[model samples]
Target: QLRAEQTRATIIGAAADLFDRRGYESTTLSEIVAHAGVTKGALYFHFAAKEDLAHAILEIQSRTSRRLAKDLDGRGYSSLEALMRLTFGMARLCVQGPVLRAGLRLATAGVPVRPPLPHPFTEWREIATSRLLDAVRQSDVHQDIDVDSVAHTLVCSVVRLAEMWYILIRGMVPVTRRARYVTLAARLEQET
Candidate 1:
């Protein structure tokens, strides 16, 4: 008794899992069908092609991450504080599940061939830039004196940290509690 929505969700979920484990070039549609327990016809009915299926995964991941950042809106946070809060929040969002992991893996894997999709970097860059501009108006960022570079660096740093922390917390690296990584993000602001 599976609804269309359930069928689609299962397929996407299976695709994400497989994509995360195997790069886009290595994963097969047949493997996804097997994991999802769906017929090839069912998968094809929903997804016109492999590229389209990957796009759907990216869209789901992208929407989830933007919503996570949007939730922080209207917190009345200082510019510098908001930058750290939102950046860290969004990074955590991106590592939350297989969709995010798969979208990032597939998107980056195809970058040499694909134009663009799952552009989290741009979204983070905008958040960092906007906060830096506000911090400049408030005089908090004047001492740093490279607002553009600082914003760029912060965005870069958050993304790197997010990926590493995901690995660390997952026991792929040395194991640790999750909250330490959250607390670490706060220090990057202090240095700013």
Candidate 2:
């Protein structure tokens, strides 16, 4: 059972890297097999369709989300600090990871991405909302701030950051939004 799980994860990772580079439409089952160094039968045993495999790539953040929550739970980060840490950490992941680009864009795709994965946006908003509420609790955010609205707005930056991965990947300038993200972090740090 453990071996089965491991094989499945390995295939998913390999496919993710492939999809990361070539995209879902460009990649093939045989290519995934070649990249994974697994046989066709092995790939089929784990995944049903190429679409299934591609959508699976988006779940990397889903896995990492739980991992980050667990890690941050142990640490005593202030609510604002936690939000910044989580946001920056995820951006860095998108920058560092080939797979994450596919994951980030999965939601906006014309093709189907079904239940269980809303492409990580909803989950991020929840995390942001929780941390923003905490920020208010700690007085890190102004009491005047509408926590819910602010939380959703801040979550938009995560989506922007997600889109920026491609900009970074293409060697294009990150331009104003890069500065905006940094400026937001700095603004969040200063207490009234």
Candidate 3:
């Protein structure tokens, strides 16, 4: 049926949510089927196995990150502004999309991504380093700062911050605090 695509996406979303909350090893096929409210056959039609679902989520996460970075490159924002927007956009996506959150969680939890897909942390470091170099050239960042060190630092910071934001997404913390950090992202962007 035409609803095949919709059912496929539903399974992916459910699998992502479980992967996000429980981590890859802890999540199971039955859980995903239950969460998605789909038949096992429906999920199997779209994904042969749990690993396939994980791979699909990883692909989506990587593609999304690349698109955001590419779009920012075309926008010609200052290196500082671009970097800020990138991180904020990532945080926004991490909060709003279970796939990004799940991929990150899986990556951090030491799940292995398939060939040709660079690790998420490696990709983030590359993005950060490229922008940080530009920031240095533009005098937004002090030349004395080591680009690689700062890039790694920035990647770590974003990942940790995203983790905290993920907790916030579940309403385990005060929603009022969301404004503070998002505003903080903007404030940090402007100051640089």
Highest lDDT scorer: 3
lDDT of 3 by residue, 1-192 (tens): 777777988898998999988888988999999999988888877888889998899999999999999898889687656776788788777878988899898888877889999998899999989987886686655666678986787788778444433442233223443454456554644543
Candidate 3 regions off by >4 Å?
160-192
Model-by-model lDDT, in order?
0.65, 0.66, 0.78
Which scores better on TM-score, 2 or 3? 3
Question: Model 3 compared with the native: what TM-score?
Answer: 0.82
Any residue pairs clashing in model 1, and if so which?
A: none
lDDT tens digits, residue span 1-192, model 2: 566666887787787787666777777999888888878878888789988876677666677776886687569866555666676677667777767776765554554666766647677788878877776676555555676775676667566443333332223223333454355455543321
Q: What is the TM-score of each candidate against the true structure?
A: 0.72, 0.70, 0.82
By summed lDDT, the worst window of 10 consecutive residues in model 1 runs over 168-177
Measured with C-alpha atoms, the lDDT of residue 89 in candidate 3 is: 82
What is candidate 1's CA lDDT for residue 153? 68
Error of 1 at 131 (Å): 1.9
